[PDB]
């Protein structure tokens, strides 16, 4: 089917503009068109086969600029095109897609910690604010399951969170769900099968390698096999029934390792390494560029 794991931006010494794509079929990496502005703490997502880079921050030697930008990469043309900007800058944002619409969740702007949420309409090229979360969350994990939007963990400006909430679009309303077993900010959050996975993160004391998953039916969080590396501010995505985690920060170095979770065997294995270690990347999956 020819889909790649795209990684956009990230941080190592400074915010980066790399766009690189990994092919699990042959293990190859491709460096593609750079982002127009270097961004870390951004989020990636895909709508209509187009890759989107949302929010983040340019942590440069001379500046610390939070981003409200929404930029669209087209694999057919290998070019970035700007889109309408969000209502507010959002560093360490969370992003989910429901029915072709992009939801931007939380994130930080200076010392402000957002509870606000806004929804992007690609063909109309418009952002609109929706109901804010019950909790302010930066470094929040966000995923979509059964057309419901989940915001998991993060940092409210005072405490790191094990809490999580769910957004029900037809009622424009947020509801708390079962809290995680572990306090997690900067975790990788994705959906695999009928479960929301929360991998890694920071509990206030150490970077985590534990992973727990939420069964939306039973409303319980259960630990699965831990990752090989402790990591927070990691990239995460799902590809053909497996979780891929990319990079992050383990408290010592910026990782380049890419681990892969197989739910059938409940095991993690390293499948490749990124061209360089980095944290705070935006990751998504779409067609290969040609």
């Amino acid at each position: 089917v020819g889909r790649l794991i795209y990684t956009a931006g990230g941080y190592f010494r400074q915010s980066l503009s790399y766009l690189e794509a990994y092919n699990p079929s042959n293990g190859s990496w491709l460096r593609l068109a750079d982002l127009q502005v270097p961004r870390s703490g951004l989020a990636g997502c895909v709508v209509g086969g187009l890759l989107y880079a949302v929010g983040g921050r340019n942590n440069s030697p001379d500046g610390n600029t939070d981003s409200s930008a929404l930029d669209c990469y087209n694999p057919m043309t290998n070019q970035w095109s700007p889109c309408a900007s969000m209502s507010v800058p959002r560093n360490r944002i969370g992003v989910g897609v429901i029915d072709g619409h992009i939801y931007a969740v939380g994130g930080s702007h200076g010392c402000i910690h957002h509870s606000s949420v806004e929804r992007y309409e690609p063909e109309r090229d418009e952002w609109h604010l929706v109901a804010p979360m019950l909790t302010r969350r930066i470094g929040v994990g966000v995923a979509v399951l059964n057309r419901l939007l989940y915001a998991v963990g993060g940092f409210d400006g005072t405490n790191r969170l094990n809490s999580a909430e769910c957004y029900y679009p037809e009622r424009n309303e947020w509801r708390m769900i079962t809290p995680m077993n572990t306090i997690r900010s900067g975790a990788g959050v994705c959906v695999l099968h009928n479960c929301i996975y929360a991998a890694g993160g920071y509990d206030g004391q150490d970077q985590l390698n534990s992973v727990e998953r939420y069964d939306v039916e039973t409303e319980t969080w259960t630990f699965v096999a831990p990752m090989r590396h402790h990591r927070s501010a990691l990239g995460i995505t799902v590809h053909q029934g497996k979780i891929y985690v990319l990079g992050g920060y383990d408290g010592h170095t910026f990782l380049d390792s890419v681990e892969c979770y197989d739910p059938d065997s409940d095991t993690w294995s390293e499948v490749t390494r990124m061209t360089s270690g980095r944290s705070g990347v935006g990751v998504a999956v779409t067609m290969e560029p040609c």
């Binding site: 900067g186 993160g201 920071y202 970077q207 920060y249 944290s279």
Partner: peptide, 10 residues
């Protein structure tokens, strides 16, 4: 250092 991301703040 931002212990969650590894980023230098100043």
């Amino acid at each position: 250092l931002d212990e969650e991301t590894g980023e230098f703040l100043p």
